[PDB]
């Protein structure tokens, strides 16, 4: 397994995507995963390591462009909504 | 003038008291937050 890179994971059949982080969430030795609401599998314990991880889906947002018009120019900006300036 | 200024100054004082003490003083603003967030909740529950 890897961490902090959003991967097409497959833990025991649970097929998804997202970044995996170490968990502080107190599992119990008979708990396999957690879902906060709406079947959102939020955490999961790997089958081999027995280590619990959190799953946050890798960042996404809308992209909206800022144009001055067409007859005025063709130069534009681009806004990556609610994304930290670390991705493309 | 002097008394009128006191009534006005005093009336303003009771406002924050009536606002701070009595909860449910902002019933109107709280609904538009409650409803509009309750409605979002049902939207997600429907994914399950």
């Amino acid at each position: 397994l890897v961490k902090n890179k959003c991967v097409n994971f497959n833990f025991n059949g649970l097929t998804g995507t997202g970044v995996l982080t170490e968990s502080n969430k107190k599992f119990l030795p008979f708990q396999q995963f957690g879902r906060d609401i709406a079947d959102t599998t939020d955490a999961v314990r790997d089958p081999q390591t027995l280590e619990i991880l959190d799953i946050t889906p890798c960042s996404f947002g809308g992209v909206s462009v800022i144009t001055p018009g067409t007859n005025t120019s063709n130069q534009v900006a681009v806004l990556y909504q609610d994304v930290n300036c670390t991705e493309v | 003038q002097k008394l009128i200024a006191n009534q006005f100054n005093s009336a303003i004082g009771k406002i924050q008291d009536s606002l701070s003490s009595t909860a449910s003083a902002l019933g109107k603003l709280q609904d538009v937050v409650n409803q509009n967030a309750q409605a979002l909740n049902t939207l997600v529950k429907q994914l399950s």
Binding site: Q81 | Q30, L40
Partner: peptide, 24 residues
Amino acid sequence: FNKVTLQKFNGLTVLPPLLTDEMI
């Protein structure tokens, strides 16, 4: 601002208001 009790999952979002509160 203390007497009220104002999170995204999938497709949901909350655009921020244009007039910030310290402008309002």
